[PDB]
Amino acid sequence: MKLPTNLAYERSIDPSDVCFFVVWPDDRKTPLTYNSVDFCHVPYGASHIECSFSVSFSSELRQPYKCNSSKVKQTLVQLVELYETKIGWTELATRYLMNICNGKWLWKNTRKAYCWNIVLTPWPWNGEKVGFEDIRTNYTSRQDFKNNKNWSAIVEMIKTAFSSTDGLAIFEVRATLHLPTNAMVRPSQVFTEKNSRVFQSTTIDGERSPILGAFKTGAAIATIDDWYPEATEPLRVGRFGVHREDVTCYRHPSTGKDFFSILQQAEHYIEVLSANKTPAQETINDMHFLMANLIKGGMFQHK
Amino acid sequence: MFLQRPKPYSDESLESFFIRVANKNGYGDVHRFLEATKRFLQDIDHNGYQTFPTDITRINPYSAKNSSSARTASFLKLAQLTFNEPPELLGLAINRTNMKYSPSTSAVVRGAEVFPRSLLRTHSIPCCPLCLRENGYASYLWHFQGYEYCHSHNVPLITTCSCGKEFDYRVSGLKGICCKCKEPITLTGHEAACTVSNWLAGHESKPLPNLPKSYRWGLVHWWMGIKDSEFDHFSFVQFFSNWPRSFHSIIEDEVEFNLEHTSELRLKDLLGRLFFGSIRLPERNLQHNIILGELLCYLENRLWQDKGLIANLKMNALEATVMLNCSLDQIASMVEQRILKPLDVTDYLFHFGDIFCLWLAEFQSDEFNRSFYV
Amino acid sequence: CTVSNWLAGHESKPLPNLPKSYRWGLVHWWMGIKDSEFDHFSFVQFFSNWPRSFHSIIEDEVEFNLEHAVVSTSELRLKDLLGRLFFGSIRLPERNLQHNIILGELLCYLENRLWQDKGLIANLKMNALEATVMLNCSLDQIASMVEQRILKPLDVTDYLFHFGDIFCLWLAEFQSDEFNRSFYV
Amino acid sequence: KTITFLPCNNESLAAKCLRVLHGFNYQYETRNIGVSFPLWCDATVGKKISFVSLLKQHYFVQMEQLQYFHIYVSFRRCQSIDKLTAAGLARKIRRLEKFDPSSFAQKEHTAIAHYHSLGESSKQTNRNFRLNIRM
Numbered sequence: 001m002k003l004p005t006n007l008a009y010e011r012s013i014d015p016s017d018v019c020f021f022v023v024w025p026d027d028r029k030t031p032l033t034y035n036s037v038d039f040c041h042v043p044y045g046a047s048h049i050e051c052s053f054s055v056s057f058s059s060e061l062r063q064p065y066k067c068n069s070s071k072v073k074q075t076l077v078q079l080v081e082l083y084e085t086k087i088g089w090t091e092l093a094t095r096y097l098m099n100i101c102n103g104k105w106l107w108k109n110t111r112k113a114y115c116w117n118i119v120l121t122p123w124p125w126n127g128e129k130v131g132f133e134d135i136r137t138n139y140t141s142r143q144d145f146k147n148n149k150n151w152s153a154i155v156e157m158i159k160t161a162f163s164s165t166d167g168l169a170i171f172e173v174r175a176t177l178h179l180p181t182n183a184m185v186r187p188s189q190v191f192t193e194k195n196s197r198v199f200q201s202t203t204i205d206g207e208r209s210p211i212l213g214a215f216k217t218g219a220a221i222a223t224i225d226d227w228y229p230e231a232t233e234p235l236r237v238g239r240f241g242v243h244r245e246d247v248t249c250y251r252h253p254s255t256g257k258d259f260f261s262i263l264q265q266a267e268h269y270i271e272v273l274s275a276n277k278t279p280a281q282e283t284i285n286d287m288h289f290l291m292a293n294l295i296k297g298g299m300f301q302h303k
Numbered sequence: 304m305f306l307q308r309p310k311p312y313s314d315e316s317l318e319s320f321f322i323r324v325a326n327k328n329g330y331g332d333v334h335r336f337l338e339a340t341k342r343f344l345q346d347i348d349h350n351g352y353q354t355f356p357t358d359i360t361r362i363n364p365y366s367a368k369n370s371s372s373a374r375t376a377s378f379l380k381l382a383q384l385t386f387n388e389p390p391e392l393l394g395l396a397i398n399r400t401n402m403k404y405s406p407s408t409s410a411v412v413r414g415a416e417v418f419p420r421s422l423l424r425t426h427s428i429p430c431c432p433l434c435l436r437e438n439g440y441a442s443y444l445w446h447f448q449g450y451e452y453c454h455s456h457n458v459p460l461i462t463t464c465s466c467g468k469e470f471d472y473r474v475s476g477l478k479g480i481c482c483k484c485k486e487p488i489t490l491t492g493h494e495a496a497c498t499v500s501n502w503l504a505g506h507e508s509k510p511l512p513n514l515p516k517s518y519r520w521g522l523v524h525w526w527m528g529i530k531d532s533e534f535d536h537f538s539f540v541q542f543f544s545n546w547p548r549s550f551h552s553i554i555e556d557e558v559e560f561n562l563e564h565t566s567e568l569r570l571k572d573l574l575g576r577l578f579f580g581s582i583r584l585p586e587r588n589l590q591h592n593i594i595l596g597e598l599l600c601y602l603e604n605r606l607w608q609d610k611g612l613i614a615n616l617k618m619n620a621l622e623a624t625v626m627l628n629c630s631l632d633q634i635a636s637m638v639e640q641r642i643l644k645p646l647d648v649t650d651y652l653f654h655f656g657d658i659f660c661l662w663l664a665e666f667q668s669d670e671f672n673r674s675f676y677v
Numbered sequence: 678c679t680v681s682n683w684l685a686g687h688e689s690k691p692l693p694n695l696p697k698s699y700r701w702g703l704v705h706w707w708m709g710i711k712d713s714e715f716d717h718f719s720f721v722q723f724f725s726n727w728p729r730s731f732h733s734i735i736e737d738e739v740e741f742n743l744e745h746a747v748v749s750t751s752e753l754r755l756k757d758l759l760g761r762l763f764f765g766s767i768r769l770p771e772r773n774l775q776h777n778i779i780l781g782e783l784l785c786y787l788e789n790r791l792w793q794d795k796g797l798i799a800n801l802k803m804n805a806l807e808a809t810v811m812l813n814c815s816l817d818q819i820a821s822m823v824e825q826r827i828l829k830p831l832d833v834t835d836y837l838f839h840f841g842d843i844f845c846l847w848l849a850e851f852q853s854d855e856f857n858r859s860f861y862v
Numbered sequence: 863k864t865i866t867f868l869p870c871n872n873e874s875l876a877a878k879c880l881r882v883l884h885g886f887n888y889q890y891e892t893r894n895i896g897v898s899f900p901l902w903c904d905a906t907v908g909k910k911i912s913f914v915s916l917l918k919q920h921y922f923v924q925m926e927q928l929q930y931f932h933i934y935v936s937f938r939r940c941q942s943i944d945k946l947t948a949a950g951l952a953r954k955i956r957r958l959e960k961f962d963p964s965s966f967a968q969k970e971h972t973a974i975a976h977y978h979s980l981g982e983s984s985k986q987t988n989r990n991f992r993l994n995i996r997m
């Protein structure tokens with residue numbers, strides 16, 4: 001299958017900036033501040049640290065945002081509707097939601113912490129805010145998340161959000177970090193075309209405060225890729241999926257398992273899913289990687 | 304994290320060791336133990352904590368794509384800190400290595416022993432349930448092809464229960480209880496496979512030669528190349544019962560086959576199969592590589608017989624480095640100073656009798672020299 | 678008289694039972710330590726306190742080098758701390774640690790000191806030239822392992838690799854039936 | 863005399879020379895001899911070290927045998943720069959409690975003018991510090 005001259009999707013997951021707060025004893029909150037290299041640390045008499053942001057799951061995956069070929073547009077709508085029927089959204093929605101429910105979006109601040117807690121506030125929801133108390137003790141594996149009282153009701157939101165023409169699924173995430181006395185906090189930092197590290201900041205009340213960026217947060221929800229050859233650890237979902245510790249591309253075009261080679265086999269995947277014999281694990285792995293890049297969105301053009 | 308070492312055994316595999324550490328230290332399974340082990344390596348700032356697997360199957364360092372150097376640093380970190388008395392865990396792992404076999408087969412290494420890569424089992428690991436209920440662990444010999452019977456119970460190994468389901472001890476524990484029927488597996492008696500199993504285990508088995516364990520697996524890979532098929536236990540023991548005059552009978556039949564099917568004959572046109580398929584099995588130590596040690600014994604007393612038939616066989620500069628164990632830079636230097644008498648590297652300009660006597664002049668070693676087959 | 682009976686091939690105590698290729702390698706190595714001609718009296722006495730006499734030299738060499746270091750403790754190189762003992766014991770005659778007891782014991786001493794003293798030994802800088810000396814490989818395999826990045830960082834004479842990463846790459850991809858860790862255990 | 867370094871790092875080598883000057887002053891209980899560096903450039907402390915008012919100590923003699931040695935202004939320690947680090951800001955508040963700790967606030971904008979700390983350590987304890995030295 002050819003790539004068109006116009007093909008682009010919108011993202012289906014929209015995180016926000018993460019704001020930091022300092023909770024003092026007798027329970028009053030103050031935005032965290034820093035010095036100027038920049039250095040940010042917990043103040044002395046502080047109890048713990050709040051972190052808060054929001055995530056939406058908003059079904060932009062079903063149709064392309066822009067596509068000048070009606071043959072390629074009907075090829076998408078068969079793929080998403082057959083992935084939904086044959087495989088289902090249970091695997092991807094579990095892997096996204098586990099990065100929210102542990103502290104994956106708290107990058108290096110989970111490091112050297114006594115305990116941290118996550119409280120969800122889903123919007124199309126009745127009551128009883130979903131709590132995850134004492135991660136690193138209670139919520140270790142996939143089975144630990146499933147033993148929560150309401151884990152099926154929140155996975156079935158993200159399933160319903162992806163499986164509908166208007167699915168919404170807003171989460172309000174709030175964390176509670178118990179650090180040591182005068183501990184490090186590592187926020188995100190700006191890109192300078194040049195030790196000389198500048199933080200990213202907003203304004204809460206009248207004071208500067210470190211943030212952990214909206215694009216930085218979305219890169220932590222989408223560390224799912226482990227379907228590549230060897231798959232020692234999860235990789236941020238992207239085309240020709242890269243690692244950034246080592247400047248390498250796993251899923252190089254020489255491997256033949258990047259996203260642009262799987263697009264040329266997208267017509268082949270429709271007859272595999274429309275049969276009755278269950279597909280092989282390797283093929284579905286390429287279907288999970290196909291779907292996770294349409295949730296990521298992007299320009300998919302050529303020429 | 305603070306752990307207790309179980310009863311140590313130098314023949315236990317690595318996947319059987321983590322099950323016994325987890326069962327002694329009160330964990331639920333091995334999936335939980337490795338996931339708690341990854342949590343400890345994060346807490347002491349290890350560089351490759353995130354590549355430490357939670358799967359028992361991929362634990363070995365040949366499994367890791369790029370975490371091979373971080374995996375063995377992780378294994379060396381655990382044995383020094385988390386135990387009351389330091390165990391031996393690097394000695395039970397199956398590492399990759401740069402050693403190649405003949406002609407181009409790669410290899411793996413486990414402690415003081417080098418295995419062929421192609422004989423490593425990757426689909427389903429057989430087991431002996433009698434050793435699982437007497438010794439209490441699993442051996443590393445179950446991961447390699449050829450080892451088909453138990454060397455101490457003389458019972459064939461099992462890959463499938465009576466209810467059609469396979470039994471892998473890495474996913475089903477060390478007890479010997481099946482997953483579907485939750486029953487012990489019913490067993491499924493020759494002699495020729497029992498001798499090789501006692502020979503591959505490291506004990507003296509007659510008439511098979513007393514070799515180190517790195518070389519005993521090299522003969523099994525070599526015997527599969529001669530018959531050009533899978534390994535046969537009956538013809539293998541019979542071949543070494545008539546050692547060395549059975550191996551002399553093949554080489555006579557090979558040179559009579561290639562002469563009939565003479566100054567233009569090459570080394571690859573007369574002895575291309577036997578010579579190049581016996582150089583590195585695993586190495587050139589003629590004290591223990593009895594195939595290359597006897598082939599050079601046979602070709603020494605036949606150099607200038609039949610008007611110098613063997614000594615006039617043509618060779619390249621590529622296949623001169625294979626015999627001399629040198630590089631193309633030393634070959635190009637020995638055509639400058641002309642210790643070796645005649646550049647196109649793929650050109651046939653050298654004779655086998657000149658390469659054989661250049662080795663006796665400038666390229667012997669303490670292990671690859673003529674003084675062992677005398 | 679003891680060394681003459683030892684170089685002849687017979688068992689001479691306290692000198693180690695080695696093959697004849699290795700017994701001459703120790704005599705050449707002992708002339709390099711004292712940086713003079715061979716002394717028969719100090720040679721037999723050195724192996725009377727084996728291996729804890731050889732441990733006493735390596736402690737005195739790293740204490741001498743650290744005090745006289747001309748670069749930042751983090752800029753320390755492998756040739757600036759163990760340039761004499763390590764490179765003067767690789768091939769005597771070869772890397773068979775079963776019989777080369779000098780390289781077999783030096784790697785035994787540096788295994789239990791990798792991440793002690795805040796990782797002093799494991800952070801020593803190395804080139805790509807002196808990485809091939811330890812790994813027993815070529816510069817083409819080194820340049821391949823920076824393409825696929827089994828080895829983590831090209832100028833061949835540049836100090837881009839740490840000793841703890843080279844030591845654990847050897848335990849991963851470069852053991853043999855003679856040069857591996859399983860002999861000095 | 864002036865000791866000129868000719869082999870490198872002038873930071874972590876001039877700090878070793880002051881530790882020998884440190885341990886000399888508690889054997890003999892003398893405080894007369896001082897230290898200064900003529901090549902006190904912005905990029906580095908320099909390769910020249912001079913004492914005015916040591917060469918018979920074991921450090922300078924063994925370093926002389928190797929290939930590398932040769933054997934108005936005021937250089938004073940500024941420990942206010944040690945208080946500007948955020949670990950030192952917490953040391954400052956613990957004394958003032960020994961009281962609202964949330965009433966304090968960070969400076970959020972600080973400028974530091976050429977502090978030139980030489981890294982050293984203690985021998986009475988196992989503890990590290992710096993030599994923040996200006997003109």
Ligand SMILES: [Zn+2]
Pocket residue numbers: 431432433434453454455456
């Ligand atoms: Zn058995």
Ligand SMILES: [Zn+2]
Pocket residue numbers: 464465466467468481482483484485486
């Ligand atoms: Zn069964």
